[PDB]
Amino acid sequence: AEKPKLHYFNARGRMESTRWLLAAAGVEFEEKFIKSAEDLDKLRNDGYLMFQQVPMVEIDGMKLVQTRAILNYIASKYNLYGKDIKERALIDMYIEGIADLGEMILLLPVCPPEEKDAKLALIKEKIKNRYFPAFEKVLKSHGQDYLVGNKLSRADIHLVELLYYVEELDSSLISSFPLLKALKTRISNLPTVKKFLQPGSPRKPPMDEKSLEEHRKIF
Amino acid sequence: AEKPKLHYFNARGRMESTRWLLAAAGVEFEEKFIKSAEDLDKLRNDGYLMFQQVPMVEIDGMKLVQTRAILNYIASKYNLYGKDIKERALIDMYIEGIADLGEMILLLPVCPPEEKDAKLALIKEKIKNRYFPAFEKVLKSHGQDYLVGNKLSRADIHLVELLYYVEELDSSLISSFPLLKALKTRISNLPTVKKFLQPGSPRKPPMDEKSLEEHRKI
Ligand SMILES: N[C@@H](CCC(=O)N[C@@H](CS)C(=O)NCC(=O)O)C(=O)O
Ligand SMILES: N[C@@H](CCC(=O)N[C@@H](CS)C(=O)NCC(=O)O)C(=O)O
Ligand SMILES: [Cl-]
Ligand SMILES: [Cl-]
Ligand SMILES: [K+]
Numbered sequence A: 001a002e003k004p005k006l007h008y009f010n011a012r013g014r015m016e017s018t019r020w021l022l023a024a025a026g027v028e029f030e031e032k033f034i035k036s037a038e039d040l041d042k043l044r045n046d047g048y049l050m051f052q053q054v055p056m057v058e059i060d061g062m063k064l065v066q067t068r069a070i071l072n073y074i075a076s077k078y079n080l081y082g083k084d085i086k087e088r089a090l091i092d093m094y095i096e097g098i099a100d101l102g103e104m105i106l107l108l109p110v111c112p113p114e115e116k117d118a119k120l121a122l123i124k125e126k127i128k129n130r131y132f133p134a135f136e137k138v139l140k141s142h143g144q145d146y147l148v149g150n151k152l153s154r155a156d157i158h159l160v161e162l163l164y165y166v167e168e169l170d171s172s173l174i175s176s177f178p179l180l181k182a183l184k185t186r187i188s189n190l191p192t193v194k195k196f197l198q199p200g201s202p203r204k205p206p207m208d209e210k211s212l213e214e215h216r217k218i219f
Numbered sequence B: 001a002e003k004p005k006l007h008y009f010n011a012r013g014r015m016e017s018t019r020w021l022l023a024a025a026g027v028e029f030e031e032k033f034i035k036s037a038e039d040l041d042k043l044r045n046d047g048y049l050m051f052q053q054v055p056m057v058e059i060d061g062m063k064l065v066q067t068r069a070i071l072n073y074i075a076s077k078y079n080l081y082g083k084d085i086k087e088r089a090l091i092d093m094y095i096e097g098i099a100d101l102g103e104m105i106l107l108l109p110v111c112p113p114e115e116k117d118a119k120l121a122l123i124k125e126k127i128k129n130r131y132f133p134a135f136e137k138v139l140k141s142h143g144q145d146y147l148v149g150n151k152l153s154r155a156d157i158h159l160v161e162l163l164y165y166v167e168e169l170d171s172s173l174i175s176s177f178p179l180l181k182a183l184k185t186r187i188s189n190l191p192t193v194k195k196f197l198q199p200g201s202p203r204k205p206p207m208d209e210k211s212l213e214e215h216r217k218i
């Protein structure tokens, strides 16, 4: 069984949700870090990046780019995409909500600093009034441990990844959402996930002022 | 038999790719157009919109929001999402590229006016050097009429949609890409797509800064 190989910077960025999903599924993978503009040029010139961009994942004979394509493939392969078309529709709707909020956060430290504090408050309010209530409502309507089909899926994993990111941003945001808190604890305790949250795993740290400025300089 | 209901404004925006897919698949649908802040409030208050946003499509007993979720469901249901996991991976890769370029073009008339010149030039540079070559290469390497599995899929339909948007932007960008021209012709002459492209269909015009700087008030 040939191990998936992830090509990305040694950073969270657009590769983290893939690290989470693979690791939640107990799937062992290798990372090949891109450290120089030469490292990227080499992947490009080898014809390995369909749109000249990373992330790229080598898996089951394919050089897969585009985050959503990579994630969809992994989730079907490891039975984390529900069990039929309608379950997939619910999963997709949830993760796309997650992706909207998460995209706003991914792209917050690269925004204009005079309207960056306007952007931070906008997020915070969407979280409290838009997204966290939407997921709390799903959990409450099923009363089950999982968002869809009463079974672990990518939606649970990605929601919990998101709750970790929202906690780094402000710890009080989840405080009035008891069902989200319990989901985070439950998923964090699954064996694969617990292992991923432990030190020494492929899970990556947040980008700080140092690692961001250096990245832009060399690429 | 029992039609999908699309909830959006009377415009392309984020609902147009859904109109194209449903039309291509042979599926007749209804549109319930949002006209005021008050129609949108009703949708919200009635618990129709999971994240308070449109597009929303009522289909097969569900109330689906999020463009990609809608498209993904329609594509599987009507067998436009390939035959297996590996083909769906190709389709997904291709459609996500299309989406990236398509979003750049969607947001073009909305960027700060002073960035418009630079952004348009970068879009045209991406089209000529990144996107169109990628897709030309796929069609050339297989020698087939369709992008994936020698069979019609959403990737053909959504690429051809994008070739129409790019044509509106600049009709010369496709000129050095003969297999893209030929795919456009072929898909355009499929009866369902031909019908949808005819005058009178649910196909929507380009945004105008009339209906644009006025649909923000919704
Ligand atoms: N839609 C793509 C975006 C990929 C992307 O924006 N990659 C960036 C790095 S995070 C890149 O390789 N930039 C190089 C370039 O566009 O020339 C995805 O989700 O994978
Ligand atoms: N990622 C979502 C975006 C949906 C979206 O941005 N909808 C806009 C109009 S096109 C909206 O309902 N905005 C109202 C709001 O954000 O309060 C999708 O693809 O459906
Ligand atoms: Cl996911
Ligand atoms: Cl599509
Ligand atoms: K689930």
Ligand SMILES: [K+]
Residues within 6 Å of the ligand: B146, B147, B148, B149, B150, B151, B152, B153, B154, B155, B156
């Ligand atoms: K195809």
